[PDB]
Symmetry: C3
Subunit: 257 residues, 3 copies
């Protein structure tokens, strides 16, 4: 801890750094070489840090409508829209597990209020209300005006990803990385009185083949509920667009690189 700056022994480094051994130890039980299975499972396979961040974002958080859903990899059950645990179906393409889904179940109260949401489904286009075989449907909806505004103005970006190409890591919500959605949303925001302007954010997806579409402005939430029969992957919505950030963060945290 004391010396200026020269090559460290293993013992010195174990003293200066946070070790993986120490991280394992947070969860280790009864002097066993492995973390308990039922813990590993819901814990991103040991990652207590990721799990910590993720956990509160997933639950409660005050302005988020009645139960987020994120079906994670390597698990048996996930909680649906009503907060209940249901069986996961995992989906294969080319011998690889791409994703899981569950029955949406019953959203007690509609989305509302001038917020932002990211929803992801298997084969069920929420906008068009139609099935798209072998695609994953990504939907981002948001207020364009601020919570304090007196203008009702909303929009959405959307795209469909062939299941073979699907990769959780290549999706994000952004206000800085250039792409069709950010550009469109930026133009859409600028239609409002300056005082009522949001910080534009877009649906960025970097998977070749896929183009992301952005709607026109709406003055009414593009999506209010989700049919309970819906094969659902991920669903999260704040009542306050000012916090759209946390929704990107949740999603980023839900799935491994």
């Amino acid at each position: 801890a004391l010396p200026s700056n020269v090559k460290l022994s293993k013992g010195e480094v174990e003293k200066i750094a946070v070790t993986k051994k120490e991280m394992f130890d947070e969860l280790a039980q009864c002097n066993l070489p492995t973390i308990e299975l039922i813990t590993r499972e819901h814990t991103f396979n040991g990652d207590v840090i990721r799990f910590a961040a993720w956990l509160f974002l997933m639950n409660g958080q005050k302005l988020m409508i009645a139960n987020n859903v994120a079906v994670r990899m390597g698990m048996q059950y996930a909680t649906n829209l009503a907060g209940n645990n249901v069986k996961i179906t995992y989906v294969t393409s080319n011998n690889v597990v791409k994703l899981g889904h569950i029955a949406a179940g019953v959203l007690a109260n509609p989305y509302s209020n001038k917020g932002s949401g990211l929803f992801i489904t298997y084969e069920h286009n929420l906008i068009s209300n139609q099935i798209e075989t072998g695609k994953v449907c990504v939907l981002f909806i948001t207020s364009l005006s601020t919570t304090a505004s007196s203008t009702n103005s909303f929009a959405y970006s959307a795209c469909s990803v062939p299941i073979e190409d699907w990769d959780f890591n290549m999706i994000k919500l952004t206000a800085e990385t250039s792409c069709a959605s950010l550009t469109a949303m930026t133009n859409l925001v600028n239609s409002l009185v300056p005082g009522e302007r949001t910080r534009p954010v877009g649906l960025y997806v970097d998977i070749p083949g896929v183009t992301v579409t952005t709607s026109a402005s709406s003055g009414s939430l593009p999506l209010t509920t989700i049919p309970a029969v819906t094969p659902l992957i991920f669903s999260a919505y704040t009542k306050q667009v000012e916090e759209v950030g946390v929704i990107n963060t949740l999603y980023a945290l839900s799935y491994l690189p």
Copy 2:
């Protein structure tokens, strides 16, 4: 300072690694050499990562009954069944502090509806309702059927531990590590209709001398509430057995190895 493989200086390791200094620095105040007392106490002595993970598990989580209790080491007060801070009494064997307890207080509503829970008390057997002098009493209760099922079927595992041999670390819930509780519990689940079967989890305890007993199937929760006057160490219960995993995680997180 990132692309090569041999022999790092202290200064390089401090850039490449997450350091203890930085972790200390999340909690440091006023350029002082130690973390503030009143913060160290409830923070597992500065372990902010542990504390992060633990915190949300300990509170709210929408399917857990009205207030988990985990009396932690080296603290003044713990919150009881009613969520109120009451004085901890610490217990000594052979000049070593083994564990603390509090008056259980008042569970507003009964445990209920096909869940799982772990309870640990000082000297009070919750099943036999009698005092066992110098024993620590472990009770794990669970549904055998799924939440979706139409069968009321419940069981519990239990054992008593001599206070001198007590070790928070040698207990866990498991579905993989071989033991008498897992075995019994496996056989018990297999008495149900395939579609209603849960993944069996047993109470595992590696303290020599101790044997863990498992009940027969019950169809009615082995345990519904806790007498207010009870000396309580740990109590946690979910309404949904499918998440019994979190209960193991919480417990694992509450006590240091």
Copy 3:
């Protein structure tokens, strides 16, 4: 085992910054998404973790802590609503941000502890103090189980030029004016009803911190909605004043 490590070995033994980055990395990009960085203490996921729950719900805390963080746009006010931040500057340095307090639904109550920080508005004196940051700490002196209503506060005013979030804490151990006074005041109560004394410690020279007399009713119950507010957080149980310090510590970088 017990000899000089290569960078590959270090990366296998240590938690790396690269891995921490990767908790939040998206789309193979060299930076963490802005809207994510912003509310995340710039990528510090561990800090953000601990902070998050401390800031929200937590059972015994009155209807919405406020803590205006650095480098953000909006912060949640007393009502739980997101409002615009005004950042304040002294000598080309950003010293702090504030928001209109807004409407605290229910009054602070029942034998707790609160830390409050306002720009220029002394909540006790109810008067403007130009160029000062106002720190107020209020607490029960007796325990929740007690049958005595006894309260006190400590307070000080800090010139905006000298303001540093890091030189403030709540303490029961580090010697200071507020600790001493607070210990004396506690010791006027029946032993069984005695709290563990904690003081408002502030290590910015020029500033002295005043501690009140004992009250028998809370020195502060509410906050005028117009108040320029920086930090606000109150538990109903004084036994947990520890968590209020931890929330504060976690809200601002060293």
